[PDB]
Paper text:
To this end, we decided to investigate the structure and mechanisms of the PROTAC MZ1, our potent and fast VHL-recruiting Bromodomain and Extra-Terminal Domain (BET) degrader, which exhibits preferential degradation of Brd4 over other BET proteins. Of note, MZ1 forms the most cooperative, stable, and long-lived ternary complex with Brd4BD2, even over its close homolog Brd3BD2, explaining its preferential Brd4 degradation selectivity. To gain a deeper understanding of degraders’ mechanism of action, we determined structures of multi-subunit catalytic complexes, composed of the full CRL2VHL, an E2 conjugating enzyme loaded with ubiquitin, and Brd4BD2 as the “neo-substrate,” all assembled together by MZ1 as a representative PROTAC degrader. By combining cryo-EM structures, cross-linking trapping strategies, and biochemical identification of ubiquitinated lysines in vitro and in cell, we determine the structure and mechanism of the entire PROTAC-induced Cullin 2 RING ligase VHL catalytic machinery, and how it operates to catalyze ubiquitination on its highly specific neo-substrate—the second bromodomain of Brd4—that is recruited to VHL by the PROTAC MZ1.
We next reconstituted a full Brd4BD2-MZ1-(NEDD8)-CRL2VHL-UBE2R1(C93K)-Ub complex, and evidenced the mono-dispersed nature of its full assembly using mass photometry as deemed suitable for cryo-EM grid sample preparation. Given the complex preference to “lie flat” in the cryogenic sample, the reconstructed cryo-EM volume presented anisotropic artifacts; nonetheless, the map was of sufficient quality to build atomic models. We could confidently build atomic models corresponding to Brd4BD2-MZ1-CRL2VHL within the volume. (D) The ~4.0-Å-resolution cryo-EM reconstruction of Brd4BD2-MZ1-(NEDD8)-CRL2VHL. The E3 ligase NEDD8-CRL2VHL (green) recruits MZ1 (yellow), which, in turn, binds the neo-substrate Brd4BD2 (purple). We did not observe density for NEDD8 or the WHB domain of Cul2, also consistent with the highly dynamic neddylation state of the CRL2. In our cryo-EM structure, the neo-substrate Brd4BD2 is recruited to the substrate receptor VHL in the same overall orientation as observed in our previous cocrystal structure, with no notable rearrangement at the VHL-Brd4 protein-protein interface as “glued” by MZ1, consistent with the tight neo-interactions mediated by MZ1 within the ternary complex (left). Brd4BD2 displays a conserved interface proximal to the MZ1-VHL binding site, and a re-orientation distal to the MZ1-VHL binding site, toward the E3 ligase RING box domain. The “open ring”–like structure suggested that an E2-donorUb conjugate could potentially approach substrate lysines or an acceptor ubiquitin within this ~10-Å gap.
Residue numbers in the entry:
A (entry chain E): 1 to 118, 136 to 194, 199 to 624, 635 to 658
B (entry chain B): 63 to 208
C (entry chain C): 1 to 104
D (entry chain R): 20 to 87, 104 to 108
E (entry chain D): 16 to 112
F (entry chain A): 347 to 460
The structure:
């Protein structure tokens, strides 16, 4: 049709509109005639001419809404023996009457507020009023029934999940037009009941069970409480209930928990430790006392274990103790309690206390011990390990010694020791030394090994510039002959220490003197690294004398060889003769003389050459003492 | 509704298919917009403007707002990559409601507003429509909801 | 293409988006879907020249190139009436009055 | 008395030598660094940003000397 | 139902959708209140105060809006006739959807 | 061919120094055609009849159609003076044009002969 305008009759229109509202809301399916006539009547009422009829029609609708609220309230008040079920059913009936909300009253939704506004919301206000008429007076009964059902479920009976959920939902769902309704309706009483229950349960359990039993029962109860909160509430307050229970049970007993935690940690009851750590992790104050006790116990155990070290193998014992303690503590803590960075810091502090414990009456030589341990692990005379094992040991030692006090002292000791071990001809692998140095340089910084770099560049600069001069000689004019190979390192000369300043000018054998002089003559061209003093205390070699009982020359140092090259003048000499020929001081002269006399190399002091010198090995060396 | 006085060139002319004459709103030092010359429906208008400027499209002979590039207004950008671009013109959700309000305002002069065979709701409530400062402020009211 | 159609017959009313390249037989199938009267008994005509179900939307000249966006495309509707197809009958709509004494 | 051998090790060397010439424009120490050349008392790497010109008797501060013989430091 | 049977008072029977106008949340919410439910749901609409040609043009416009609501294709303008402007003004001021 | 000129090299250097971000922020519209039909200036070109810009100077210097840096100076003077005669004497436009021309001259105050 194409319907022209019309004049409406208020009374008949209201009667017809009510006759459709009743058949729609009342859970009844009505004829298509009424279905189609409802909207037509509504429009005819809303289209009054030549004036408005809103005030009247809207007043009638509002009276209808108030009547619905009051009638629902009374019908529910008929619910004495079925309060909760009746409340749920009536709320569901109203919710279904609104769930038909895709039918008619969009005009009511959006043609009144924008007729006297920018006085409430219409459908939301209808829900709120229906709650006021029945819910607003019956809140006592509804809350009481909910609490009774919760208590009964806590006792062992089966509750009414769907009814509980809907009854809880509606009151918050009153106003759409956000946490006002629900967060002001249920959260408070729910949390209050949960807190009372948790307080009673914790008070009973604290005496009804031991620490581990209480912790396990509390974990199970917390899981059950989370399940119940999920079943009977939304995520807006589940955290509130859980936190209230946690404060009641795992919070109020923090002091007793820490009192037992000393023994718990000292007993390493993995399950109990995990339970305590979990219960205290979310708590502000749960960590500190346990962390302190654990750190103290670990440090004390490590120190006590290390006290029994055998004098022969001190570095090995220290390394083993540190590795064992660190491994056990890290494994336990990271397996039990989610890996607290506070636990990592406490482990670092305990390890530092263990390592930096220096006995009174002596200086703490831990860095020197570690450096010597690394040197021994890299040694070529102590078999039992592989190169990969050495690399792993260095990697472990870096993280172990991260907390050693004497960093600079350890560095200087290692530098001197490696300098000696390379001066002696024992560094079987500059690459293995460089792997240890790679650990030390990935850990100790760039300045940590700038000195090592200089010392290496010195072994080279000597190697490099001297080789250049030797090559220039190989391209030179005159002839040359060696008869004895040799090697040297004087380069950029400030990497490793040999720091004893000279005291007496050295007069060494012309044998090596010629090599030194030719080296200087070929070398003095175009380089500059170190320009330091003499670090040449390492002079020695051999010569084969076909004039003794047989040709036999054993290891002899530079002083002894120079004295014997003074023997290239006379075989019998007094002390003054050897002293002058060597240019050495009194202490070195006496030491060399005694060593040469007792070593079978010789036989108001006087000395003579040995013509019958012999030993158990035809190749034996007069030793240098400093070793 | 106050344009940005960047002075950084934005080399673009917006292809505006407005069926009337194209004289959109503009920006002043404090924000004063003024009409512009005629750009008819289908063709574009070319002018160099200032970076940071926000402007939209309307009907030159209707005076009603049609969302700037369908949005609030074609927006301010600087000159990088040197390419042309524009915030073109287009209707809002093409409303028979606005069409009827403006049709009443057109078939009856602005002095013919409260004179239906009806009561005095049409003029204000529905045909209190096209205006430059109004359209601008109301689009800005949307953008204040935003 | 989008051909705009609106069929007035008796007191009926129907509309859709009509394919210009598709079939008037498709239009009849749509009419069957909308009315419970398959294209078998349906009969649509652009004016009086009968548009066979083989004649597409462009067979009548009404397409999205000329179809009215604010008003539907003219369409006549005649259905099957027992042993014959009742002729197309569409009367005129409401009568419009003149303009007010000050608005014309 | 007998020695028909060759197999000493020996040593004598090492010839230290600082930077060489007169490098005054602003041009701080040729053997030290400039103001910012060697004002870095925690450093000695002046000796590697050093003061020399070439093999032709040049020297200066490190940076403003290079951009302004010993291979020394 | 397939269609939404909309008929005015003056004789004819017609069908129009609401989802088709959903961009018209006007339609989406005007079909938005008290429970109207039957097993044979076909969206029947009986009113006695609407114009016929106005309803037809409004149905065309509703199809347009349901095709253009977030659609990115070409769009025409709003077609109206100069016979019902005042009635449309009152009707809109009542509807606002 | 063209035997390179020291003035031409200094002109390339001046164009470079103009290629700094400092100058384009005010003479950037002059680095390209100040449209005569851009704002309805049917008489802008009638008044200024020597089309030129920073790009004009760059092109006249790169193409090798200029005799020396005096030509670049003359072109800069022509462009700046046309802008000034287009603008009034009480405006920021005069301020900017004078700033640009004076800066050009002062900076040219450091290029010697070749
Ligand atoms: C013929 C036509 N048909 C269809 S549309 C059209 C048409 C299109 C554009 C124009 C001119 N453009 C405008 O009116 C633009 C369009 C829109 O974006 C708004 N608008 C403005 O100019 C606005 N202006 C601004 O936002 C900047 O405001 C500064 C006010 O002065 C603008 C110009 O003054 C009025 C006329 N005078 C001139 O153009 C002198 C000219 N100005 C300028 C000039 C102008 C402004 C600034 Cl900030 C700097 C230089 C100028 C040059 S060369 C050059 C490249 C320019 C830009 N110049 C020189 C050299 N000497 N004189 C000039 C407005 C409305 C405030 C005047 C004229 C007609
Ligand atoms: Zn100097
Ligand atoms: Zn430097
Ligand atoms: Zn020289």
């Amino acid at each position: 049709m194409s319907l022209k305008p019309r004049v409406v009759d208020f009374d008949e229109t209201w009667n017809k509109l009510l006759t459709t509202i009743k058949a729609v809301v009342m859970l009844e399916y009505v004829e298509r005639a009424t279905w189609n006539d409802r909207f037509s009547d509504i429009y005819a009422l809303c289209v009054a001419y030549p004036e408005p009829l809103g005030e009247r029609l809207y007043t009638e609708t509002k009276i209808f809404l108030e009547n619905h609220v009051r009638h629902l309230h009374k019908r529910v008040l008929e619910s004495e023996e079925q309060v909760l079920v009746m409340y749920h059913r009536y709320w569901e009936e109203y919710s279904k009457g609104a769930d038909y909300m895709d039918c008619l009253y969009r005009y009511l939704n959006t043609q009144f507020i924008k007729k006297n506004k920018l006085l409430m919301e219409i459908g939301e206000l209808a829900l709120d009023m229906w709650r006021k008429l029945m819910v607003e007076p019956l809140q006592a009964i509804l809350i009481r029934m909910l609490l009774r059902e919760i208590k009964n479920d806590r006792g062992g009976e089966d509750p009414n999940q769907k009814v509980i959920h809907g009854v809880i939902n509606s009151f918050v769902h009153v106003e759409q037009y956000p946490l006002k309704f629900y967060q002001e309706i249920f959260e408070s009483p729910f949390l209050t009941e949960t807190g009372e229950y948790y307080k009673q349960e914790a008070s009973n359990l604290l005496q009804e069970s031991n620490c581990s039993q209480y912790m396990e029962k509390v974990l199970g109860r917390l899981k059950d409480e989370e399940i119940r909160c999920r079943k009977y509430l939304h995520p807006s307050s589940y955290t509130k209930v859980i936190h209230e229970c946690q404060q009641r049970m795992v919070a109020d007993h923090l002091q007793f928990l820490h009192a037992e935690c000393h023994n718990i940690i000292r007993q390493e009851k993995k399950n109990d430790m995990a339970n305590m750590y979990v219960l205290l992790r979310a708590v502000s104050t749960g960590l500190p006392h346990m962390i302190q006790e654990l750190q103290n116990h670990i440090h004390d155990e490590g120190l006590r274990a290390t006290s029994n070290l055998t004098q022969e193998n001190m570095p090995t014992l220290f390394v083993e103790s540190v590795l064992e303690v660190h491994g056990k503590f890290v494994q336990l803590i990271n397996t039990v309690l989610n890996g607290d960075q506070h636990f990592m810091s406490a482990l670092d502090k305990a390890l530092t206390s263990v390592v930096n414990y220096r006995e009174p009456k002596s200086v703490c030589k831990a860095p020197e011990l570690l450096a010597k341990y690394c040197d021994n692990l890299l040694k070529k005379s102590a078999k039992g390990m592989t190169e990969n094992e050495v690399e792993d040991r260095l990697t472990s030692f870096i993280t172990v010694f991260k907390y050693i006090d004497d960093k600079d002292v350890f560095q200087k000791f290692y530098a001197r020791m490696l300098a000696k071990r390379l001066i002696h001809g024992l560094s079987m692998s500059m690459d293995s030394e460089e792997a240890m140095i790679n650990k030390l340089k990935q850990a100790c910084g760039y300045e940590f090994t700038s000195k090592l770099h200089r010392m290496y560049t010195d072994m080279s600069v000597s190697a490099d510039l001297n080789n250049k001069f030797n090559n220039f000689i190989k391209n030179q004019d005159t002839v040359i002959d060696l008869g004895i190979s040799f090697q040297i390192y004087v380069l950029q000369a400030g990497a490793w220490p040999l720091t004893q300043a000279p005291s007496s000018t050295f007069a060494i054998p012309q044998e090596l003197e010629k090599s030194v002089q030719m080296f200087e003559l070929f070398y003095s061209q175009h380089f500059s690294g170190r320009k330091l003093t003499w670090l040449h205390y390492l002079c020695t070699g051999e010569v084969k004398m076909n004039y003794l009982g047989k040709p036999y020359v054993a290891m002899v140092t530079t002083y002894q060889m120079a004295v014997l090259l003074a023997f290239n003048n006379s075989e019998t000499v007094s002390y003054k003769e050897l002293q002058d020929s060597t240019q050495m001081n009194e202490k070195e002269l006496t030491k060399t003389i005694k060593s040469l006399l007792d070593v079978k190399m010789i036989n108001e002091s006087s000395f003579s050459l040995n013509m019958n010198f012999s030993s158990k090995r035809t190749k034996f060396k007069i030793t240098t003492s400093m070793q | 509704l106050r344009s940005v006085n960047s002075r950084e060139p934005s080399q673009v002319i917006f292809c505006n298919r407005s069926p009337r004459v194209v004289l959109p709103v503009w920006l002043n030092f404090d924000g004063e917009p003024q009409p512009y010359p005629t750009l008819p429906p289908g063709t574009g208008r070319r002018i160099h403007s200032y970076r940071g400027h926000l402007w939209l499209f309307r009907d030159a002979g209707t005076h009603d707002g049609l969302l700037v590039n369908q949005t609030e207004l074609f927006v301010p950008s600087l000159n990088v990559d040197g390419q042309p671009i524009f915030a073109n013109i287009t209707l809002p959700v093409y409303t028979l409601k606005e069409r009827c309000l403006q049709v009443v305002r057109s078939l009856v002069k602005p002095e013919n507003y409260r004179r239906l065979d009806i009561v005095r709701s049409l003029y204000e409530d529905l045909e209190d429509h096209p205006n430059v400062q109004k359209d601008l402020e109301r689009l800005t009211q949307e953008r204040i909801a935003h | 293409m989008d051909v705009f159609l609106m069929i007035r017959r008796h007191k009926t009313t129907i509309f859709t988006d009509a394919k210009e390249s598709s079939t008037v037989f498709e239009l009849k199938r749509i009419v069957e879907g909308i009315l419970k009267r398959p294209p078998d008994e349906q009969r649509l005509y652009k004016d009086d020249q009968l548009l066979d179900d083989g004649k597409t939307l462009g067979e009548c000249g009404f397409t999205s190139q000329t179809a009215r966006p604010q008003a539907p495309a003219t369409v006549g509707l005649a259905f099957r009436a027992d042993d014959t197809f009742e002729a197309l009958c569409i009367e005129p709509f409401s009568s419009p009055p003149e303009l007010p004494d000050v608005m014309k | 008395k007998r020695f028909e051998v060759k197999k000493w090790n020996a040593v004598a060397l090492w010839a230290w030598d600082i930077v060489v010439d007169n490098c005054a424009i602003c041009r701080n120490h040729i053997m030290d660094l400039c103001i910012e050349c060697q004002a870095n008392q925690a450093s000695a790497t002046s000796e590697e940003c050093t003061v020399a010109w070439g093999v032709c008797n040049h020297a200066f501060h490190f940076h403003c000397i290079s951009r302004w013989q010993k291979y020394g430091h | 139902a397939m269609y939404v049977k909309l008929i005015s008072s003056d004789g004819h029977e017609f069908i129009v959708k609401r989802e088709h106008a959903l961009t018209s949340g006007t339609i989406k919410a005007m079909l938005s209140g008290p429970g109207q439910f039957a097993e044979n749901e076909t969206n029947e609409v009986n009113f006695r105060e609407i114009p016929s040609h106005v309803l037809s043009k409004v149905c065309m416009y509703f199809t347009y809006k349901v095709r253009y609501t977030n659609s990115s294709t070409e769009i025409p303008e709003f077609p109206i006739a100069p016979e019902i402007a005042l009635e449309l003004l009152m009707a809109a001021n009542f509807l606002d959807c | 061919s063209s035997k390179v000129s020291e003035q031409l090299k200094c002109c390339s250097g001046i164009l470079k120094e103009m290629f700094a971000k400092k100058h384009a922020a005010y003479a950037w519209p002059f680095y390209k055609p100040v449209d005569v039909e851009a704002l309805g200036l049917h008489d802008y070109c009638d008044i200024i009849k020597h089309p030129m810009d920073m790009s004009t100077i760059k092109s006249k210097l790169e193409a090798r159609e200029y005799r020396d840096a005096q030509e670049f100076g003359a072109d800069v003077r022509l462009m700046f003076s046309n802008c000034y005669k287009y603008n009034p004497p009480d405006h920021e436009v005069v301020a900017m044009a004078r700033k640009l021309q004076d800066v050009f001259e002062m900076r040219f105050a450091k290029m010697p002969d070749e």
